[PDB]
Design an enzyme around this catalytic site. Sequence first.
Site, PDB file in Angstrom:
ATOM      1  N   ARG A  55       0.862  -1.219   0.000  1.00 42.39           N
ATOM      2  CA  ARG A  55       0.000   0.000   0.000  1.00 42.39           C
ATOM      3  C   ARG A  55       0.881   1.245   0.000  1.00 42.39           C
ATOM      4  NH1 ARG A  55      -1.970   2.874   5.086  1.00 42.39           N
ATOM      5  NH2 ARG A  55      -3.350   4.466   4.183  1.00 42.39           N
ATOM      6  N   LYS A 110     -13.265   2.859  -0.471  1.00 39.76           N
ATOM      7  CA  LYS A 110     -13.116   2.990   0.952  1.00 39.76           C
ATOM      8  C   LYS A 110     -14.386   3.546   1.543  1.00 39.76           C
ATOM      9  CE  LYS A 110      -9.161   4.842   2.279  1.00 39.76           C
ATOM     10  NZ  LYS A 110      -8.081   5.905   2.244  1.00 39.76           N
ATOM     11  N   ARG A 145      -6.465  19.140   7.758  1.00 45.54           N
ATOM     12  CA  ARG A 145      -5.347  19.014   8.709  1.00 45.54           C
ATOM     13  C   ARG A 145      -5.154  20.317   9.472  1.00 45.54           C
ATOM     14  NH1 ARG A 145      -3.403  14.188   9.172  1.00 45.54           N
ATOM     15  NH2 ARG A 145      -3.007  12.741   7.447  1.00 45.54           N
ATOM     16  N   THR A 170      -7.001  -1.180   9.533  1.00 42.65           N
ATOM     17  CA  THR A 170      -6.729  -0.092  10.486  1.00 42.65           C
ATOM     18  C   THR A 170      -6.720  -0.547  11.927  1.00 42.65           C
ATOM     19  OG1 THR A 170      -7.529   1.622   8.970  1.00 42.65           O
ATOM     20  CG2 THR A 170      -7.066   2.356  11.224  1.00 42.65           C
TER      21      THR A 170
END
Lengths: 507, 498, 506, 505
Positions: free
Chosen positions: B60, B237, B107, B295
């Site tokens: 990944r 996702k 962010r 995760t």
Amino acid sequence: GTAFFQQQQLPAAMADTFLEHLCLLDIDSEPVAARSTSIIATIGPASRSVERLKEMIKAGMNIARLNFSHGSHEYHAESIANVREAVESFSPLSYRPVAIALDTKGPEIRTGIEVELVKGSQVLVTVDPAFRTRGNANTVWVDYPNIVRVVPVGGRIYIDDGLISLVVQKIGPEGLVTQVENGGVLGSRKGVNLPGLSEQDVRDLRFGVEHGVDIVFASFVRKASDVAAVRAALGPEGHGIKIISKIENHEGVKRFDEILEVSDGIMVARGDLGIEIPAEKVFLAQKMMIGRCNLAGKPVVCATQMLESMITKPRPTRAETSDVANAVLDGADCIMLSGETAKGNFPVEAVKMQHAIAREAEAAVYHRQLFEELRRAAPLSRDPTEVTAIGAVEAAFKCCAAAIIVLTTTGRSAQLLSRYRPRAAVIAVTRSAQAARQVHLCRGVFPLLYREPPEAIWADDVDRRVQFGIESGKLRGFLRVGDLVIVVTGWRPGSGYTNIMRVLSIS
Amino acid sequence: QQQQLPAAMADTFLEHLCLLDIDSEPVAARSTSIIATIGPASRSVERLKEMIKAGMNIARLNFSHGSHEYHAESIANVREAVESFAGSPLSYRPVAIALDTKGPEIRTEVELVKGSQVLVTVDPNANTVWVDYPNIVRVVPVGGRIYIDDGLISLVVQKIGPEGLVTQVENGGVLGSRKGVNLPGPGLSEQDVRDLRFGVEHGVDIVFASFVRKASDVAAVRAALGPEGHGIKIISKIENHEGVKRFDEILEVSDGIMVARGDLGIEIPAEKVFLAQKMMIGRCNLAGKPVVCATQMLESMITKPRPTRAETSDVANAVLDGADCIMLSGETAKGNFPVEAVKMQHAIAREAEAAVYHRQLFEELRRAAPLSRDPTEVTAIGAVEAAFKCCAAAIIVLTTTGRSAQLLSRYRPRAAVIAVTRSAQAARQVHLCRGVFPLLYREPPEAIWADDVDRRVQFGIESGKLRGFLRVGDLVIVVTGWRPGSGYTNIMRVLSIS
Amino acid sequence: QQQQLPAAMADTFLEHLCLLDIDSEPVAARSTSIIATIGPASRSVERLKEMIKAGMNIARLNFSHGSHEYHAESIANVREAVESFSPLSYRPVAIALDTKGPEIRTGIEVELVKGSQVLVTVDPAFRTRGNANTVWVDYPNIVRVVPVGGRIYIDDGLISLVVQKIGPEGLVTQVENGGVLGSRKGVNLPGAQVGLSEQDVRDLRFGVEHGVDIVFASFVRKASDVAAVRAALGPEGHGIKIISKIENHEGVKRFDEILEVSDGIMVARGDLGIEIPAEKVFLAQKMMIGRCNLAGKPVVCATQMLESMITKPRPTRAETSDVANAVLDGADCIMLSGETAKGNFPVEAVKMQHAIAREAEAAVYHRQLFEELRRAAPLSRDPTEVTAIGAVEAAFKCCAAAIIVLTTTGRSAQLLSRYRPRAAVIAVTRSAQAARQVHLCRGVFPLLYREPPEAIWADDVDRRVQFGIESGKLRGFLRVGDLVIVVTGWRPGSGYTNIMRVLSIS
Amino acid sequence: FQQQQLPAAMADTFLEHLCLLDIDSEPVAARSTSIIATIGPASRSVERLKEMIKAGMNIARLNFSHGSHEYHAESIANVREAVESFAGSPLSYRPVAIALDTKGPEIRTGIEVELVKGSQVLVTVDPAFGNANTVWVDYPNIVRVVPVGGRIYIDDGLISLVVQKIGPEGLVTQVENGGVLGSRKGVNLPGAPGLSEQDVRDLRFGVEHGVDIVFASFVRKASDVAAVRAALGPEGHGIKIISKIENHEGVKRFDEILEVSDGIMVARGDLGIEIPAEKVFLAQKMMIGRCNLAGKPVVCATQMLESMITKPRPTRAETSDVANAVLDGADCIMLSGETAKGNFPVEAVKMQHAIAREAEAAVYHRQLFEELRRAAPLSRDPTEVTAIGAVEAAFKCCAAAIIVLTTTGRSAQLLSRYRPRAAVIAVTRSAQAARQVHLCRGVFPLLYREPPEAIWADDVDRRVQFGIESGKLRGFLRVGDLVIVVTGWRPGSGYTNIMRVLSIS
Ligand SMILES: O=P(O)(O)OC[C@H]1O[C@](O)(COP(=O)(O)O)[C@@H](O)[C@@H]1O
Ligand SMILES: [Mn+2]
Ligand SMILES: [Mn+2]
Ligand SMILES: [Mn+2]
Ligand SMILES: [Mn+2]
Ligand code: NA
Ligand code: NA
Ligand code: NA
Ligand code: NA
């Protein structure tokens, strides 16, 4: 398209439970598939002619039964001669093999040579040469000397299809002192029941070898050694003959597993069985024996009085159509007609009626449950024919294949497909005329006899047989352009090498 | 009996669990793929070699971090590591390379005191946080919630002014630089489009598409990949409430799905994530499309050489849920034990695969798969039925695109699906599918097609012997087709290994 | 459409998974009990009140650490917290004594380097002399039971030594797996061979002295280990429930003989996951829970369930999964250790387990579970068992809000709980101990009845059932118009349950 | 306790169940499928009806196709006299229901010739009327309702004619299926009428004579059932209406029929002429399935032991047919000519008893209870709730019986629909309910005759004691058995809400 899923009880097929499946059974949902449960018709004066035999084959007879209880060797030679001539005297894509099954006389006990036997009555059962033709209201003679040394005090004796009964009192030296339990009118030479293999049976089995019969229905099989006696009587020349053991009494029910193990198949012989055990228990024995045969993948035949009233009436009773449908839903490979074809006034109609009912009942089979249960109870196998068979049946259910086409030398590859009860017809192509007749014992196997000598190149000979399968299927209505078919073959010539399954569309 | 076979025979699920046996050793090759995330701990060629031997099947690339140059180096290093094993064609392991998009990221050490005042600003300390999402100041009302840093801190707006959002710290904590912001109460980004074009030009196999909320999010990814990128697999996702609720329309248009549990568990209550996970795995099993569980699977292995009891359980249960692939993130990208973490997922997955109750699972998948007139699907279920009947060690299938192998995989055979292909991309890509073991065949075509078919079958068998999948006396089921080119699989054969 | 009802009516397990819905809210009371470990983070009466509010049902005293006086204080604080909360709302909290067991520990931070030589010594003169090349252990016979080549694990299995030679000074080992080593860390010898120590016996009698409800018995390997515990509890401790901790290979292999004599099981995953491979623990967990479910005995899942909440206010994705799957596996109780004993978020950890367990309970596929429990329990002529199954079936048929049961010992409530009704099992008892103990059984909500017996026994029975109703209503379990099933018996005293009745709530 | 097919009951699959069926496993349970015997010359006398009741007859059917009201009045009085001759032993008395079976839309022929296949035959409705060329029928509008070609069936459908032409003479047909023909035979016109004035006079007669049950002929839709209900009137509100399904429309409309009916008869005689004979078993198994699902009684009827009209023992197909009707799920099985006219009416009842008891033991409860359980809807009715809880309890402990108190029959019916293996012993003061619950498989009614005790709870207990005492006298129950007892919280119908587990002392 849309009309397809209305037919062959498909709505009831995808129900999630058995009860829901029953609730969804639909009298407007028409059968589509070829009729798969084989019909055995007994030959007698109503069905002996060549032209009547041809009507019966057209009506759907797959197996002719010769009843050795009655008739001389010459009489049975002529019945066999007539069936062969009817079969031959119909195009190789149309030809229908008909098996010939010899049903042994077995351990018959008959009374001597009408009189009311009264319920209060004091009957003497003598075994005296001297009283052999002295039968009357108070004396029945029998053709079985050891009867006197074999039913004790108490102990019941049945006469005439179990319709008359006697209970023994004393055993004085003139015979058994009985009283009538169940009275009625007694004619001459009637069957006696007392709830190995004879000199006559051995002569008859050898006669069936000489005349090339395909199957023997062996009377009164009680244990493994009874089957071995038959096999021994058939001899080296008779090794190819299938032995279907007739389960007719208590011991043969109790020793069933050991009997099935050494048999090619089973007959639920309900006539004697319903006298040898309580009539009301027969259906337990039938259901159990059919289920154990299904599990073992060996043919089972249901027999006796299935359409009995059609001996004299052109339509059967409600109980009779039910019995035929229920035999098929129980899991029977073959259903049988006896007096209805041997002596009745409606032999052809009796065959058409078992065909019509069998087709309806096969479409009603709950495959979802039956396949899962067959699978989740069969043991693992390292035999490639079995592994291929289960993969082939699965694949046919996935696509609603019109057929599985299998090449077979002995019938075995077709038999192993048949045991999983595909809805797809199993079209078995063989060179063996005898295997073609014998595979009629397995539900849903439609034998095609291939008559060409081998192509030089084996693979081409294989392709040619599969094509013959396809062309016959089309001609017969089994297949149309656009159908999917599953084709089952092997990796080399000779029996035992089946290992390949291919998915084909018909063009 | 090995491989939990006595639990396999049980008549009910509950009897199956009661028969699970810690002494019953796994026999089968490990079948759930392992995705490892590349980063400073797992990026050098020497390290990647060890990752490959430990069992990594998919690398990944996390496009949340790293420039294009950085990712080009990562891709080349993966290829060098993988190719170092090509000199042994019967042993070589294809490794897929997956580009995981940045997505709609928002962010931002100092302390955020619970109850204290914090200005959230986009105007170009303990009391003031900046974010790179200018429109934040108009899309969070009074008293909407702002989560910060893996959702461990949260604020609730009290006022809106031109200096920005005046908030109250509701959940307090220690805040570092540039941490993730979630606003659970955008499109396909511009950076994402440039990153997708990078992916195509570098020949990536798979794209993991961030925050897919509906079908047209998938379509925008396909459009960005363009005609050159038609063969790349798109794994959507599912990261938020809307993706969960629109799951069916998303799965319809996707090659498969990632349960992206990090964002998912901030975007919906953390206690509901296992429901979303189990539902989406079940639906993906039903549809026969790959699903990835991702995760914090072995999170503590970032700093510790062994996992907690909850992490081993989470991995095992992801396999039992039905996941095709399991993933490692910070565990291989930055931790101190990236190889041990891969090894640990390998060991757990092997145990959990053996524990699968096939008896019920096959029946359910079989019963719910619709009727099909497609010969590939017909042959697949026939072959998987056959494999179960004889305890086949493998099912060997020839495949150009991977499809014939994926259709075998959707039934969850216990037999390994050994997929022999000439397509290097298909061999990489088929790692998305549980239990498919890709073999890249390199020989030019034999003059006679049927010989060419047979040689590739032999190559399957001889790779399988070398790799310990197969011994003399085993049965295998071979799946092929009637003519060359994809889409003609139609033949299943039972063969004994000599 | 709440409580995963649409996924409950699915025809197959896979269809059930497919219909699980994150929008479908739990409506039922949380049924899986929560066991919290007492320690410095949770000892205060104020904190304990917070924890009982958050959902803590059983307090665990870890006898691995702390003096009798320290545990006496923990017990005292739990009792005072419980008593300082109106009888229709009273919540019993059980106290479980968890034994120290056959612990091996190092002596009184330092680093062990992979490949270095470390002496393992039992010399008393070295107890306080541990360093980079020397570890003291409190197990003198360790020198006789780890051969050359044998492995010694230290600190939750994180460090690992291999014996290279044996001499007067001890075991000379090579560090196989190195790491940072503190004081008094646990040691495991999974290769090795050796009941109830003298300390455990004193600890158990202290348990009896202070009226503990439950013992968690460490490293139970065999039925005789349970008998040694029952014996140590003596005459006065007959009523104390023994939950056997399965912690090593032998306890797994001898599981059935252990369950047969135990009141229930703890899957003690900490030692289990060192004593057998960490990757096999889930197989042991799922087997042992499944077998406990079948036998109708309570089973606890323990250790590291929400480990990261020791220092973080929210758990990892793996931890929430592990709690949810323990419930789905069939656990009666789930547990917190460091998360409540020593961590910074002990109240939050309890709230988190409550939240996850409620969601996972509503996701139980009762259709398959009840059928499989039913179709594998065996026939029973016991009227309490027969009534229990009739009562649970009747509850499902009408989606009853509760089954209210009168119970002297807890048994009638436990035999209801084993069929995992969706309905709350509201258990009315005069026994304060039974009321505590029945938190071991999933879905039993104990109510302690404090009024003396009415003159007329039938009237006494009816008044207890009314109390069951009014508490049920005050607590949010029952609403006007609900159906409940009421389970009682034909005469007083334990063992005579035989009656189920269908009742509307007004 | 490997009796009652118990080892086959333990099987994991239906196929394994069949495989374990054992002819040596004796039934122990009381026979639970009720037997309906038709009254006629062979079974009409008081002394014969006593033997019939002893052999197992539960419901006497009065066939209104034949016989005057005087005739039927005498049949009713004879049954009552035979039934009440056993009343002096109230612990053993067997209630017997009386069902009036309507004539319905009957077409009969005129007033023994033979119809030659392929010959021409006029069907006539001219008042001035037969023979080989002419058949008269009593349905004037036949000439108007059968087009060319279209088929006419005569005599249990054994003869068929195909109409070629319609004249003022009537229908000129060709014999398609020939046969020997006698006086006044049944005619069927597949795919061609209301409830008749005869049928109305007959229903009123049944009301005035207190019949329990009406079997309503040729029900084709819900309004056919409303018409019967209307004709029974306010005085007949408690009579149960059992719809006879006898043609294609009745099968297709089955659901709306079942919805408004107390139950169903699979009237196989007409059904098997109106639709292809080979399709009847499908309609039978479907209708039984759906009635099981709905919890309403279903009757299998006609030719079940036909040959016993003249032979003392049945064919292998007849015994199979009876066994399979029980396995299919039938609540009641019926005899018609076998008891009305045959030479072995008592033997025929005995044979249906014997076969039913075997087949009941072979029922696969594990599957059937699960299916019935999972398909029945959620209910907030305490009677339903208590019923499923009592049935699951009875299986847990292999209860010998469930004893229920009931005023109308309903609480017993809601236990019966789950098919417990335990006998459902239903204690009632209602003599009509006691008769009527014979419609439900496995309900053994007990008629309680004592005045109510002063204290109601005592009265409840006394009736439970009486359930037990009869159970013991009759062989249902022994010392040490477990029984499940179902009662309610107050007097009056509709309050059942209690299930208890009791040991028999
Ligand atoms: O089956 P039904 O007709 O509802 O009758 C059940 C009734 O019988 C009883 O058990 C007794 O009622 P009685 O005392 O009125 O006979 C009631 O409690 C109950 O409601
Ligand atoms: Mn015979
Ligand atoms: Mn994310
Ligand atoms: Mn421990
Ligand atoms: Mn009729
Ligand atoms: Na014969
Ligand atoms: Na990313
Ligand atoms: Na402890
Ligand atoms: Na009538």
